[PDB]
Amino acid sequence: TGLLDGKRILVSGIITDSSIAFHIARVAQEQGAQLVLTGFDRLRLIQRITDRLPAKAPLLELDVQNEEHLASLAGRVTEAIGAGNKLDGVVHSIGFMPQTPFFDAPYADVSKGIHISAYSYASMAKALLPIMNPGGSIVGMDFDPSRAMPAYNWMTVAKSALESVNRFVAREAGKYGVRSNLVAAGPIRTQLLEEGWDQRAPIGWNMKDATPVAKTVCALLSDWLPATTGDIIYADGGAHTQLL
Amino acid sequence: TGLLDGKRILVSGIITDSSIAFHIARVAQEQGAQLVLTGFDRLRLIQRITDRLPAKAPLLELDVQNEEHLASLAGRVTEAIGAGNKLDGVVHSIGFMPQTGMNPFFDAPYADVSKGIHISAYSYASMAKALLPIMNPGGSIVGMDFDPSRAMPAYNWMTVAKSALESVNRFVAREAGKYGVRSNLVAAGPIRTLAMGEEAGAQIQLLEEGWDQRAPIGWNMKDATPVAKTVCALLSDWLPATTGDIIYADGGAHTQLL
Amino acid sequence: GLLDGKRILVSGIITDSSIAFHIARVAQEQGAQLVLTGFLIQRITDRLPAKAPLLELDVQNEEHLASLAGRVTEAIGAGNKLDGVVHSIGFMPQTGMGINPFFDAPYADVSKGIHISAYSYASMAKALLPIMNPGGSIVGMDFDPSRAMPAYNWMTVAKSALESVNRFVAREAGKYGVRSNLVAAGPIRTLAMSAIVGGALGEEAGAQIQLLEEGWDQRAPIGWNMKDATPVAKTVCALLSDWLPATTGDIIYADGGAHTQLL
Amino acid sequence: TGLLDGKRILVSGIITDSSIAFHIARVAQEQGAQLVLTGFDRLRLIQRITDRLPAKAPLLELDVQNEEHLASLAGRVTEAIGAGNKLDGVVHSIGFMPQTGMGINPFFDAPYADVSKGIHISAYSYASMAKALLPIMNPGGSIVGMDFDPSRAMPAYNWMTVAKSALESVNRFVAREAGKYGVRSNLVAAGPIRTGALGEEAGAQIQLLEEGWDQRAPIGWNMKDATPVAKTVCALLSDWLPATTGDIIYADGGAHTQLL
Ligand SMILES: NC(=O)c1ccc[n+]([C@@H]2O[C@H](COP(=O)([O-])OP(=O)(O)OC[C@H]3O[C@@H](n4cnc5c(N)ncnc54)[C@H](O)[C@@H]3O)[C@@H](O)[C@H]2O)c1
Ligand SMILES: NC(=O)c1ccc[n+]([C@@H]2O[C@H](COP(=O)([O-])OP(=O)(O)OC[C@H]3O[C@@H](n4cnc5c(N)ncnc54)[C@H](O)[C@@H]3O)[C@@H](O)[C@H]2O)c1
Ligand SMILES: NC(=O)c1ccc[n+]([C@@H]2O[C@H](COP(=O)([O-])OP(=O)(O)OC[C@H]3O[C@@H](n4cnc5c(N)ncnc54)[C@H](O)[C@@H]3O)[C@@H](O)[C@H]2O)c1
Ligand SMILES: NC(=O)c1ccc[n+]([C@@H]2O[C@H](COP(=O)([O-])OP(=O)(O)OC[C@H]3O[C@@H](n4cnc5c(N)ncnc54)[C@H](O)[C@@H]3O)[C@@H](O)[C@H]2O)c1
Ligand SMILES: CNC(=O)CN(C(=O)Cc1ccc(-n2cccn2)cc1)C1CCN(c2ccccn2)CC1
Ligand SMILES: [Mg+2]
């Protein structure tokens, strides 16, 4: 009798057992969801990580920069969940920005980072909306980019683009009766900038614990936020609401 | 086996069965919560309405402008739930702006604006001050908001009161955090509640019609259930790292220009 | 000058450290003809580069508000109208800001604070719009209240209300071809502000206010000088000029860019 | 006495006399600024347009996707303004998004090659321009870019809105770098400017979006007139907003502050 009982959910972005996607997958299974997982490049390595989850789940290859992987994705998911079944949820937990810092980054690096971290949220929704049920939910991972900060410079730019992409994805998803939202998380250990979060957060922030973030994603995947779309839910201990 | 199984929750703001608080109370009870209800002024009338809820719940009087009601509130709640028990949730679903403030903008006297701000914004801090000493860690305080980031033809001073409420919520979160309690607002789209000239109504109509147009998933102003479900999500253990914040239950209308 | 020939009303002078004193000085240096309002002040306004009539205005006094336009018309001469209005008025009792806990502020104190700091922006616009020329500009003073901070408490709440009031004032002002905007300044060492740094409110809160102030210069990409009100006064004069003609119901940040940076 | 008397300002983005950059250049010259102009691809065509400005100004070639143009830019500007002189202002009025990413094409049908080109020209180039020109800018200087409020999604604008969201973030980082030189960096978010071609259905949607602007704006909005936008850019180039950086100034009639 779980929050996601009977729901079929695709979870992308597992690379290690410290991945936010690993914790999202674990919490979703504990809550009764039937998962389909996607991985990039190191598929044998990813499969061994997915064996650590409480329940067995099929693992599909997905390089978001590969148009052939995107064109075949819905058919491959349909084979995994069975003909006649559709997804109730999609989790985008993918991000990358080449190490290149701000003025020295060539455009080839920035473009690759934006492709993977922002444009792919639209690519995944385009591929999967035709196999999603009404009342469905698409959730992506964000970090608040409204202010510039030292380090993560071009990744912050990619998150600003992702927030805008999410608002357009919501317009398309709405046609299918599907919601689209981002979870803006505080820093997770997957220094001064990081320590400031626990200081600002009225309820504190534990950088070593991804469970509050995973629970927030599951709340959006559930039927309990049915009138929220094109939006951002902050799972950051309330740090973004406080100056000092 | 409900979302709020075993939780003790105080719900303020029921006046009619169309009240957002009525729907919040109904959904919470369906989800296993044990409620304590508070009403203002028309207590006999409110008891007849709360008799329509799926389960029995004690009804306490609370006028948020009455300092004696606020000073005695925690003791009265403790008596209703039993000594040794504490609340897990608090719902503030209270708002009022006298007619003059809702040239309506320039003609509203300060006495009217001050009363509206007292009831709609300051009282969120008053309720938290009174109830935090009787709230359990992991607890949740939720208030009702209407997005006031942009001015709109009608609502005028009520919009100003909501801007003040959003700021109050951020300070309440600082205090609530000391008790391991979250404080958040639900910004709802327009709902056809009881209280909700020619121009005023025409402005509301256009505002209301644009909302459903702008919302990617649409907006039904006759249905308070999506709003009630969102409040219950915040009262649950499923948004444990969210505080001093605003969750929008508006069909996504605020995220779209046209 | 930037404001050559403009007739501008400036409220909020109490000392020569008042932001309004600096706004008035820069405006006169830029060729504006001023009318001043105060709630002792005549001895301070005598320190400005040019002579200007001083009118009494208690924003909580409805008789002062009802007679204001007539009194301004008498000061500037029949047939003349105002081009600009500056609201540089703010108040919150010590129970609502400083060392007092957020929950311990009584509503009577908060309400007086909101009346003076937010509602009066609408009162002033109501009284003066009938005597303002098209292309006119109303400017108010703000402190970014988007995030909660220590000590500022109910004054931050009053600023959140002021920002909302400004958006509604812009709707009304637009009917007269007048703009309405706020300048959100960084912290300025005015009369009360220097005392807190000195230790007037104690060690614990004095350190917290000092950290809040020091972080500003650290976050600001161009730095922030708390001792200098001139960049703020110049920003207000930019809004009073004809150089931001399509900006209304808005907020211009004169804070060194601190609000755009997290660390 | 002009607002920009004696200031040396670089203005990019002129293609036609309807370009926002044309109006920025005109107002800056009327206010006493000495300009250096940059143009892309159609240099002969751009020269005929810049001949319509009140004063003569050198025109330099600048393709923001060309790293050799960027590497030589500061040296070429120094030659145009004279050795020992530096710039007081820089105007970025450059934007591009292929028809696959903006217009009638569904949001999901824009290929990444087209989106990436659009982001390179419309957002990344703001950082490229600042990197090339900050070493030849005076303290108290000002870098200004053109923006269109992307905080809410809207029909047709699609990936150009995404590019503007990226530009706003780029501006905040450029301000951190510019601050080291005592230089400000800001964007001007303008309302729509007229700078059946796309069909009935989309043509009506774009028209409704445009008409709502004048309705929302408390002081109205004239889509035919770039002068209020050009004046706002000149205010940021002046010494009158000295404590504003990493920020956005809205020259949109106040439309973004009103719901209806
Ligand atoms: N860790 C934090 O502090 C934090 C905070 C807020 C948001 N986030 C976001 O959460 C998400 C997950 O990050 P994480 O912290 O779990 O790190 P992670 O390194 O564990 O996950 C990033 C994932 O992206 C995948 N990926 C990279 N290139 C890809 C491609 N071409 N195709 C498909 N997938 C690709 C990687 O394989 C990996 O699984 C990202 O969007 C990240 O920006 C992280
Ligand atoms: N209806 C909408 O369109 C809408 C939209 C967004 C948010 N909200 C908010 O939701 C909340 C509830 O509104 P509603 O639409 O259910 O209206 P409602 O009329 O049903 O409820 C308002 C409640 O406030 C109570 N109240 C007024 N003065 C009080 C006082 N002095 N002490 C205690 N209680 C007092 C009333 O008794 C009533 O129960 C309010 O905060 C309102 O601003 C409403
Ligand atoms: N750090 C700062 O000092 C700071 C930062 C940002 C914004 N501001 C704002 O700038 C404005 C001016 O503040 P200041 O720092 O110059 O301090 P100040 O004390 O010099 O000015 C406040 C003024 O408000 C006037 N006032 C108070 N009650 C009044 C009433 N009933 N009627 C009319 N006038 C009344 C006082 O006479 C005084 O002239 C305020 O809005 C303030 O919040 C100040
Ligand atoms: N027109 C509007 O409604 C509107 C509204 C808000 C903001 N803006 C922005 O104002 C700016 C100017 O646009 P406009 O409306 O004047 O249109 P425009 O077509 O007149 O100007 C765009 C300019 O970008 C230049 N450009 C394109 N590719 C380039 C490259 N590779 N290298 C260098 N320059 C290149 C073009 O040559 C042209 O001069 C853009 O950033 C645009 O997004 C326009
Ligand atoms: C004069 N106009 C209003 O204030 C409308 N309004 C109300 O009047 C609410 C209200 C209901 C009942 C009482 N009451 C008196 C005695 C016992 N109960 C008091 C107040 C509500 C206020 C809250 N709501 C909204 C509606 C839109 C935006 C924000 N808030 C719904 C209408
Ligand atoms: Mg209009």
Instruction: Tell me, in angstroms, the distance from the centre of ligand 3 to residue D90's CA.
Output: 36
For residue D169, the one-letter residue type is S
Contact D165 A168 (CB under 8 A): no
Tell me which of B214, B255, B258 to substitute to probe the interface with A (most A C-beta atoms closer than 10 Å). Answer: B255
Tell me which of C26, C138, C225, C260 to substitute to probe the interface with D (most D C-beta atoms closer than 10 Å). Answer: C260
Testing ligand 2's pocket by substitution, the residue of B15, B43, B112, B231 carrying the most ligand atoms inside 8 A of its CB is: B15
Which of B177, B229, B255 lies nearest to residue A202, judging by beta carbons? B177
Alpha carbon of D236: minimum distance to chain C alpha carbons (Å): 9
Rg (CA), chain A: 17
- CA D177, CA D137: separation in Å to the nearest integer? 12
Testing ligand 1's pocket by substitution, the residue of A66, A93, A142 carrying the most ligand atoms inside 8 A of its CB is: A93
Alpha carbon of D213: minimum distance to chain B alpha carbons (Å): 10
- CA A97, CA A40: separation in Å to the nearest integer? 15
Q: Find out whether the beta carbon of C113 lies less than 6 Å from any atom of ligand 3.
A: no
Strand-pairing partners, residue B99, are none
Of the listed ligands, the closest to the CA of C177 is: 6
Contacts of C103 (CB under 8 A, 6+ apart): B125, B128, B129, B175
Contact A203 B177 (CB under 8 A): yes
Specify the experimental method: X-ray
Q: Total structural domains in chain D?
A: 1
Contact A242 C149 (CB under 8 A): yes
Instruction: Tell me, in angstroms, the distance from the centre of ligand 2 to residue B94's CA.
Output: 4
- CA D118, CA D96: separation in Å to the nearest integer? 5
- CA D130, CA D92: separation in Å to the nearest integer? 9
The residue of chain C nearest to residue B131, with distances taken between CA atoms, is: C103
3-class SS at D142?
strand
Structural resolution in Å? 1.8
Alpha carbon of C109: minimum distance to chain D alpha carbons (Å): 30
HEC sequence for chain C: CCCCCCEEEEECCCCCCCHHHHHHHHHHHCCCEEEEEECCHHHHHCCCCCCCCEEECCCCCHHHHHHHHHHHHHHHCCCCCEEEEEECCCCCCCCCCCCCCHHHCCHHHHHHHHHHHHHHHHHHHHHHHHHEEEEEEEEEEECCCCCECCCCHHHHHHHHHHHHHHHHHHHHHHCCCCEEEEEEECCCCCHHHHHHHHCCCCHHHHHHHHHHHHHHHHHCCCCCCCCCCHHHHHHHHHHHCCCCCCCCCEEEEECCCHHHECC
Alpha carbon of B123: minimum distance to chain D alpha carbons (Å): 27
- CA B149, CA B147: separation in Å to the nearest integer? 6
For residue B178, the one-letter residue type is K
3-class SS at A145?
coil
- CA D1, CA A120: separation in Å to the nearest integer? 53
- Please state, in angstroms and as integers, the Cα–Cα distance from residue B94 to each residue in B13, B77, B123, D177, following that order: 5, 18, 8, 48
Residue D141 in marked binding region: no
Which residues constitute the domain of residue A74?
1-244
Following DSSP, what letter does each residue of B90-139 receive, concatenated? EEE------GGG--HHHH--HHHHHHHHIIIIIHHHHHHHHHGGGEEEEE
Nearest partner of C121 among B249, B157, B218, D101, judged by Cα = B157
Contact A107 D123 (CB under 8 A): no
The residue of chain A nearest to residue B251, with distances taken between CA atoms, is: A227
DSSP B241: T
Following DSSP, what letter does each residue of D102-124 receive, concatenated? SSSS-GGG--HHHHHHHHIIIII
Following DSSP, what letter does each residue of D241-254 receive, concatenated? STT--SEEEEESTT
- CA D138, CA D136: separation in Å to the nearest integer? 7
Nearest partner of A148 among C18, B247, D179, D235, judged by Cα = D179
Contact C171 B103 (CB under 8 A): no
Provide residues of C within 8 Å CB-CB of chain D.
2, 167, 170-171, 173-174, 177, 179-180, 186, 220-224, 231-232, 234-235, 237-238, 241-250, 252-257, 260-261
Contact C247 D257 (CB under 8 A): no
Contacts of C150 (CB under 8 A, 6+ apart): A244, C205, C208, C209, C212
Following DSSP, what letter does each residue of D73-105 receive, concatenated? HHHHHHHHH-TT--EEEEEE------TTTSSSS
| Whether A226 contacts A181, CB under 8 Å | no
Question: Distance between terminal CA atoms of chain C?
Answer: 38
Instruction: Tell me, in angstroms, the distance from the centre of ligand 3 to residue C112's CA.
Output: 14
CB pairs under 8 A between A and B: 132
- State the CATH number of the domain containing residue B81: 3.40.50.720
Strand-pairing partners, residue D12, are D38
Q: Find out whether the beta carbon of B72 lies less than 6 Å from any atom of ligand 2.
A: no
User: Helices A120-128 & A153-174, crossing angle to 10 degrees?
Assistant: 20
Question: Distance between terminal CA atoms of chain A?
Answer: 41
